[PDB]
Amino acid sequence: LHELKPSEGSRKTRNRVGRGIGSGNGKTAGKGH
């Protein structure tokens, strides 16, 4: 229980919008112009 490492390929960071210019989809949050 000290190092409960989850299975690989079971979780994925949620995509964000408007939290970076180099991260992608920040200016218009990937919704077009």
Binding site: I21, G22, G26, K27
Partner: protein
């Protein structure tokens, strides 16, 4: 004083003077000896026929590491362009003795 052109632009090296050469392997702590002496000078042994024959320069490999951290930034005039990168450049310090 010899002009040695080993791995890069030729450098002027007199007797008893340290220089900075690019990262050859060189096993820092040991000695090394270049082999491409051009124009050993003094008594003017020209560089006729691609590097004077028999002329070598013995050197002692002394210190390997990096340079000052040049941090290259780069961006365009528009379109949200941004790029950033650091770069430590490796180097090798060698002292100089006994021009052959």
């Amino acid at each position: 004083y010899a002009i040695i052109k080993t791995g890069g632009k030729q450098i002027k090296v007199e007797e008893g003077q340290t220089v900075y050469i690019e990262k050859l392997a060189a096993e820092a702590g040991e000695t090394v000896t270049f082999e491409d002496v051009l124009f050993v000078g003094g008594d003017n042994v020209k560089v006729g026929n691609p590097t004077v024959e028999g002329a070598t320069v013995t050197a002692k490999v002394e210190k390997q590491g990096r340079a000052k951290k040049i941090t290259v930034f780069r961006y365009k005039p528009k379109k949200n362009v941004h790029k950033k990168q650091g770069h430590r450049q490796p180097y090798t310090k060698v002292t100089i003795e006994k021009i052959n």
